[PDB]
Design a protein around this ligand. Structure first.
Ligand SMILES: CC(=O)N[C@@H]1[C@@H](O[C@@H]2OC(C(=O)O)=C[C@H](O)[C@H]2O)[C@@H](O)[C@@H](CO)O[C@H]1O
Length: 721
């Protein structure tokens, strides 16, 4: 019955597949089409023989394993996309039409129907499979009757009758929010359309509108740009991806129903883009510290995941108008063009998304200007993102506190992310491929960069924990200067350390004090564990003298500096130790497989060479202190360390401070309320984090008490002498 419902479904098909936009003369489109051709070809030659068949596909035959249901229906969706694509060799193919129809019927009878109960993961039964069924039926609606479409979607109403909750048929349902809530839309809004059910469409849209509300607690988007999911996990880069990706697909359809969403309610989407997503995108890569367990998926490395967000942003820009549309187009364009490592088209999986990107990149009317410097203090999720446009490097600080979980290990994914939030840092430089090409399965999980830990063995079965302390946070002064601290205690309460960071425009100082260890395990701080490029080797210098690193660890006592020299100055990394320190370094090939950190991934061996720098802490009360200076050549680095000779103000159990004489900026962390006199110019009076700038006889102050998550009147925390 061609009606308004089918009209909406046509729009939906144009969004999730876009065959109407296909052009065989379009190189990028032909590439996606050919990819679908091969997938359909493979599925057809392996699908089971309707003569006493026990399954459709042998590799997805154990229907006790819920993932097999979703994988099975997704193969049918691929067939639907090609049977409706005029340029596919399967266009209107009678055998494919019958295969989809017969497969739907078979699964309906023996595997997935209203009489079944959830076996395995609820997600497959309520989101993955319903979405695949909806899309298959929508795309091939001209090959199914309304009665058949209602028949194959009855099961969706059984497992997902309520647009506000998921797991409704289990003994522990939950409130749908964020990414999940958006998927609720892709399940019930589309099913509603297919079933011509007005109440389902309207009630579901009403539920979805909740996603536009910013929260000050719990899961969702925060005013400061943070995004929390799974109760207390920083998750902008995975669940937030799903949210923006899925919502941008749905909106064009929703806005054409009889229950469009108010334009002012949707205004917060622009806030997510500018506050939450943009800061996490550096040279086309989505910062891993925001992606949770997804970092353990081989097909979803940083640049790939970034496209999930970018394609969503672009669709939103396309449905916008005037300057809002223009500014968003410019954001997408500059980010994509800055990525010389990843081909954006590799993750634009529909013809419309491809078409949109191509027009964007060729439209001289859309400005593409390098992004300016910024520094986001995501205090509500304990992450900080810094970007310096003049020098061209990004910096990510991954922490956690009494308010957030350190790492997420679930669904057998991210088995070794134990220390990815123990003060771990990320450096985004000229090597855009650093955290890609197998970084996650080959990096030594016991030596995550920036972390202070003991060498005790950890079990893959362990799960995340929150921090005993709430004293973790960042005080931001401006777009280039901020200070952070973390009252760190390790997983088994055998080691502590006051870890602080001083972001000073073109460098970051790392200070650690009060390092205590009560175990018999050895303790140390990993200064860095950098993944190398066989094409761009580094020349290593210690105290400005060339060193030859080996697989075997070598000790370097009385170290003043370490410099990693590349042919490209934008890959250079220098470490300046305020006080001569005893460190050790090595360069070795590290092997591993994605399956080691994610049960569902390939066991194929992967390997990468890593340069590891460490500093042992053999006595209680130990400390470390060094300045990370990226993107400058050797001579400039050497010149800079002399300028910084007296930059360390203090690094003890109650006070940690670094001074940037060139900028006239101080970074200060106080663990108690004693009066601290700084550089004989002023005093700071309260426990907390400070970033101060002197401009003449004037002083600009940025104070933050991480525990109460509040600042305070200037006179309460600052006094000029
Ligand atoms: C955010 C997240 O990790 N969601 C899990 C699912 O992963 C997402 O799957 C899809 C999709 O369209 O199916 C898109 C995303 O890129 C990917 O992160 C999936 O792993 C699912 C399996 O049960 O569990 C979700 O929590």
């Amino acid at each position: 019955v061609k009606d308004t419902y089918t009209d909406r479904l046509d729009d939906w098909n144009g969004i999730i597949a876009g065959n109407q936009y296909y052009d065989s003369k379009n190189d990028q489109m032909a590439k996606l089409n050919q990819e679908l051709e091969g997938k359909v070809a493979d599925s057809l030659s392996s699908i089971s023989s309707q003569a006493d068949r026990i399954y459709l596909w042998e590799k997805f035959s154990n229907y006790k394993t819920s993932a097999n249901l979703t994988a099975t229906y997704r193969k049918l969706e691929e067939m639907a996309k090609q049977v409706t694509n005029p340029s596919s060799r399967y266009y209107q193919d009678e055998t494919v039409v019958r295969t989809v129809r017969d497969s739907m019927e078979w699964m309906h009878k023996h595997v997935y129907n209203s009489e079944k109960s959830i076996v395995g993961n609820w997600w497959d039964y309520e989101i993955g499979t319903p979405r695949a069924i909806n899309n298959t039926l929508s795309l091939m609606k001209e090959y199914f009757s309304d009665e058949e479409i209602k028949k194959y979607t009855d099961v969706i109403e059984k497992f997902v009758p309520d647009p506000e909750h998921f797991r409704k048929t289990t003994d522990n349902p939950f409130k749908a929010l964020g990414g999940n809530l958006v998927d609720m839309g892709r399940v019930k809004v589309i099913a509603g359309l297919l079933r011509k059910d007005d109440q389902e469409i309207s009630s579901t849209i009403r539920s979805i509108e909740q996603v536009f509300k910013l929260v000050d607690q719990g899961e969702g988007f925060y005013q400061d740009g943070s995004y929390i999911d799974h109760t207390n996990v920083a998750y902008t880069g995975a669940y937030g991806n799903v949210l923006i990706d899925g919502l941008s697909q749905l909106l064009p359809v929703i806005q054409k129903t009889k229950n469009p969403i108010d334009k002012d309610k949707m205004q917060t989407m622009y806030h997510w883009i500018d506050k939450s997503f943009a800061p996490l995108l550096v040279n086309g890569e989505l910062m891993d510290m925001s992606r949770g367990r997804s970092i353990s998926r081989a097909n979803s490395e940083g640049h790939v995941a970034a496209v999930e967000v970018l394609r969503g942003i672009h669709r939103i820009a396309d449905m916008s108008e005037g300057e809002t549309k223009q500014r968003l187009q410019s954001l997408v364009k500059t980010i994509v063009q800055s990525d010389s490592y990843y081909d954006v088209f590799k993750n634009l999986k529909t013809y419309k998304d491809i078409s949109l990107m191509q027009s964007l990149l060729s439209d001289a009317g859309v400005a593409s200007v390098p992004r300016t410097s910024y520094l986001s203090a995501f205090n509500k999720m304990d992450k900080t993102a810094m970007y310096n446009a003049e020098k061209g490097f990004g910096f990510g600080l991954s922490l956690f506190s009494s308010r957030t979980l350190n790492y997420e290990h679930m669904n057998k994914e991210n088995k070794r992310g134990w220390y990815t939030s123990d003060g771990m840092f990320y450096l985004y430089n000229g090597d855009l491929s650093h955290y890609s090409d197998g970084y996650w399965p080959t990096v030594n999980p016991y030596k995550m960069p920036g972390t202070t830990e003991t060498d005790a063995k950890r079990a893959d079965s362990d799960t995340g924990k929150v921090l005993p302390s709430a004293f973790v946070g960042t005080s931001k002064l401006d777009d280039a200067n901020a200070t952070a601290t973390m009252d760190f205690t390790n997983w088994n309460q055998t080691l502590t350390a006051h870890k602080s960071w001083f972001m000073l425009k073109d460098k970051i100082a790392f200070l650690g004090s009060n390092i205590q260890n009560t175990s018999t395990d050895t303790a140390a701080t990993t200064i860095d564990q950098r993944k190398l490029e066989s094409s761009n080797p580094y020349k290593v210098y210690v105290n400005d003298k060339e060193a030859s690193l080996t697989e075997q660890e070598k000790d370097y006592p009385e170290t003043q500096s370490v410099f990693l020299e590349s042919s490209d100055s934008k890959k250079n990394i220098g470490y300046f130790f305020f006080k001569k320190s005893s460190i050790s370094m090595s360069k070795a090939l590290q092997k591993g497989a994605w399956k080691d950190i994610n049960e569902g991934q390939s066991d194929k061996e992967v390997e990468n060479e890593f340069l590891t720098i460490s500093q042992a802490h053999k006595q209680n009360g130990d400390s470390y202190g060094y300045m990370l200076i990226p993107n400058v050549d050797r001579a400039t680095f050497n010149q800079m360390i002399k300028e910084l000779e007296s930059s360390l103000i203090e690094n003890n159990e109650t006070l940690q401070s670094v001074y940037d004489a060139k900028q006239g900026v101080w970074g200060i962390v106080k663990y108690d309320d004693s009066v601290s006199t700084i550089s004989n110019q002023f005093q700071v009076l309260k426990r907390g984090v400070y970033t101060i700038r002197k401009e003449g006889d004037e002083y600009k102050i940025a104070y933050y008490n991480p525990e109460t998550q509040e600042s305070a009147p200037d006179q309460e925390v600052f006094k000029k002498l």
